[PDB]
Design a protein around this nucleic acid. Sequence first.
RNA 1: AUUAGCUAGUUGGUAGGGUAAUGGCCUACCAAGGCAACGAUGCAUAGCCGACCUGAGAGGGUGAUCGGCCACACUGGGACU
RNA 2: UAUCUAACCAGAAAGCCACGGCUAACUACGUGCCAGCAGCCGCGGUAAUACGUAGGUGGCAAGCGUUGUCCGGAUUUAUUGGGCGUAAAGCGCGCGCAGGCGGUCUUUUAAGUCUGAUGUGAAAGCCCCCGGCUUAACCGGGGAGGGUCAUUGGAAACUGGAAGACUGGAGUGCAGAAGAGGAGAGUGGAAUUCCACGUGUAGCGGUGAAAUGCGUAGAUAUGUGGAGGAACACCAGUGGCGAAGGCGACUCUCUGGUCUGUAACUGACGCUGAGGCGCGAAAGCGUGGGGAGCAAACAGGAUUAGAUACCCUGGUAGUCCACGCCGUAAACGAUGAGUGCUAAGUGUUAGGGGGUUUCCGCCCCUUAGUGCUGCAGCUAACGCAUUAAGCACUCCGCCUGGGGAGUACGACCGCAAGGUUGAAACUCAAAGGAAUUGACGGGGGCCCGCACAAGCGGUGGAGCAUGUGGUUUAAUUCGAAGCAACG
Lengths: 134, 161, 130
Amino acid sequence: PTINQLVRKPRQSKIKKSTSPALNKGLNSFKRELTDVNSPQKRGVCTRVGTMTPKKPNSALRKYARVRLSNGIEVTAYIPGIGHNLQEHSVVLIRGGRVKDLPGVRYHIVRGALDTAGVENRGQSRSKYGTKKP
Amino acid sequence: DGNKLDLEERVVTINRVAKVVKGGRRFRFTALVVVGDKNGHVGFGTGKAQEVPDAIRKAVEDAKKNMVLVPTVDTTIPHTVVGHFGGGEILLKPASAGSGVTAGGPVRAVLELAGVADVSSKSLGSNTPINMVRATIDGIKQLKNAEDVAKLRGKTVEELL
Amino acid sequence: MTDPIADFLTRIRNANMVKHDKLELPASKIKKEIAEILKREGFIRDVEYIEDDNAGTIRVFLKYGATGERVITGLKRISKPGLRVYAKSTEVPKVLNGLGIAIVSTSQGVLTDKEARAKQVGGEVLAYVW
RNA sequence: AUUAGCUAGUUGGUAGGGUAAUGGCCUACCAAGGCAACGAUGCAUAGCCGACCUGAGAGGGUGAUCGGCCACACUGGGACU
RNA sequence: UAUCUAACCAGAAAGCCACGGCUAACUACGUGCCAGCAGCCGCGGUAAUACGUAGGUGGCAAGCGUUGUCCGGAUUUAUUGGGCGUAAAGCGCGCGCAGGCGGUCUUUUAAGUCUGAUGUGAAAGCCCCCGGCUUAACCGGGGAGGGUCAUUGGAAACUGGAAGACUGGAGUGCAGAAGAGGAGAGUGGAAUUCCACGUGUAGCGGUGAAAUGCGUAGAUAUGUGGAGGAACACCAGUGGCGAAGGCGACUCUCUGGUCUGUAACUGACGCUGAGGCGCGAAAGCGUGGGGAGCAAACAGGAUUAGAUACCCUGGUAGUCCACGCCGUAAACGAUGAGUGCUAAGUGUUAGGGGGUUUCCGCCCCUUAGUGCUGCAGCUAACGCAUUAAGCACUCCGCCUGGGGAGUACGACCGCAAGGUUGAAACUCAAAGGAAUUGACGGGGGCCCGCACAAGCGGUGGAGCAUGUGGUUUAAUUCGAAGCAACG
Ligand SMILES: [K+]
Ligand SMILES: [K+]
Ligand SMILES: [K+]
Ligand SMILES: [Mg+2]
Ligand SMILES: [Mg+2]
Ligand SMILES: [Mg+2]
Ligand SMILES: [Mg+2]
Ligand SMILES: [Mg+2]
Ligand SMILES: [Mg+2]
Ligand SMILES: [Mg+2]
Ligand SMILES: [Mg+2]
Ligand SMILES: [Mg+2]
């Protein structure tokens, strides 16, 4: 462009989207108005639990839970690891992370933080999946 | 110049590459290889063969025939320069002594095997090593010595200085 | 139009390309200054000025080394109408760490970067020469 | 600018009173200006800086702790000392 | 409390992540597109270094890893530092207010620029030099840096302001030349259809075949005469003009612009041009005419598995005009306007100049166009190449991954159809351009083979033998499965 063009309008960079929009919103009951606050993790209440058929190429059933977070946003969270404790009205803690197999999931459930009891029988990567040392 | 020296070749990329027929694919390998002597000379070559070493040696054989010189002034190139071959856009800036060469593999190889010890660089354009190396040599073709430039103009080195 | 000096530098480039021996262009004071300066620096075989009905004309005889080697690799303008460049004695940079040269027009007349350093002046960076 | 008109003590002046003090600070009278595509007006956002993190540098983001300044003490207004 | 002295004890003090590539570090079992893994690419369907576990290894280590956020890498908003022929990107084109930018010279200034001095930009923090804590972190001392900082004093090269002067830009004049440039009015004959009248007898039309349809109430054709409208062969040509859309029969009127030559005249009067104003193919909309042909829709007949289509026969809107709206386009040279510079060859158009010659005719030089091929140079390539996609400068418009989406909200316009401006959520890991190798082709070309065709004799029909399938079986062993399994 010409310099006069660049002065009449300077540049404008790209509008960045977050991987994790719902972690980046807080709530106050008083105002009843969402408040932008960068957050790593949120807790919620499992509305629904179920299985998913993932994309091509894959075919295994994937465990998800539809959660209502603390801030009121309804979110689908993958339940990683072998087996789980969860059911309806179960409280859950939620971190970000995208299940590439599965279309509508963008977040994971931290395993071992709350009523998400740790995985059974696991020995390796225990800090993930939330088993104590035996 | 020529195949008349002891040299220090280095292989940059070896790309398996496929011609295709009614009977499917007839894979071959390409080898781009940089030859030099750290007392100052460098050159790149390419070769093709169904085998890794065959391609390597053809590349060496083209390299030893398509070489050039680069000035090594005070462990640095004499001045800043840019090469522009195709999608290759690669600038070379000198740097302070003892800093070391600062570059990616396919350009680092060129400058090291010439023996230039202290240079900065940055790939601006494409990342394809063939065009990167064509860019490097297009650049270090542009480089000039102070004595040569004085001989052109009619000046003295202390007068350019 | 809007640029005599750029026309001058570009005609010199375009004659470097074809390796013409001479190149004639309408003249002005600044053009004559920069021709003088290139003759001082060692880029021009010779320059001579000519009278005409309009404005006077200038002719540059170009300088090549042996084997038809070029002595001018490149010219360039920096301070332009749409954007000018004004630099100090400290902000004029050494073209190619001193292999090439620049032109800075200052209070002490039109000069090079090195002369402008010697006189500790500054002003319009009119041009670089690789 | 998916906000272009805004202002009416608003702009200037002559008198007057008022403040620790100049001034439409306020009052009366006269004229009808003044600002604004160099973005006024309006909406949303935000305490500002030294500085902090990053970066070759230009620049990008932040304004925890430390220091300076500003503002506010449940919300609003008002004075006394 | 630190600190210091002795005594006693290896004794009580190591865990986290990963090991397919990107990236350091591989084996065994178990599982079997299940369970599960995953930052990107991607693993797992019975032999998994990619899942789980064990061993071993790598990286770190009193921390390791994941998540969230910020910079960089990302030249992916490019001042430094990008681009728009085909990839995203040139408003469809113009007229032009504002702004940006501006030919050559002299004087004047000092708005911008440059420069010496003074003052300040706190301490802490970054940086450098010393010192102190068992070093380190940390802490102290000193210095430095940092401002489009301000005042004051100087220079006039450039930009800017001012007063003059000049002409290569720009324009007027003067002498010529071309032209489907536009609007209006009128006008011509081909030629389709229709009306009448003769001659005139059984078909015509159309298709891959047909049929629907017209025709003895007389066609089809053939001649004569008349009515009506629409478009204008030859000329006519990568030829002309126009800003573009676009403009082809002729004449007249009213008009615009272009080029050539001169150096007469003014003397930078100019280039672009946001926001505005207008024009703007075809379709379409309102009112009123006209309506011959062609023809969306529609009807009938075929086709087809079906055919809401190609195909046939008919046929309304429309197409045409006046006026006014609509303002879109593969509106395209998919290439913004302007200026200058940088090899050639050759057509073609409109001009001028000169040499020769009886004009004619040939030749060369030059101006503005229009086309072909090509050097440098550019380009990812294809290709562009004095009609640049080259080298440079001014100005405007526009792009920033695909889709959603040119959608939604909002505003403006519009009678309406709808147009202009123009997002996000969400989703993907690509989308795409050019070119290469093949393969294919209800594309072409050339050549061959019992491949066809030409012929001979056969199979499929009958009975039996054999093999295979399906089935029924205690079992009817297993394998082979288009050509290339099935005596
Ligand atoms: K007031
Ligand atoms: K109509
Ligand atoms: K067209
Ligand atoms: Mg606030
Ligand atoms: Mg950077
Ligand atoms: Mg296994
Ligand atoms: Mg495009
Ligand atoms: Mg300080
Ligand atoms: Mg129409
Ligand atoms: Mg036969
Ligand atoms: Mg039989
Ligand atoms: Mg069998």
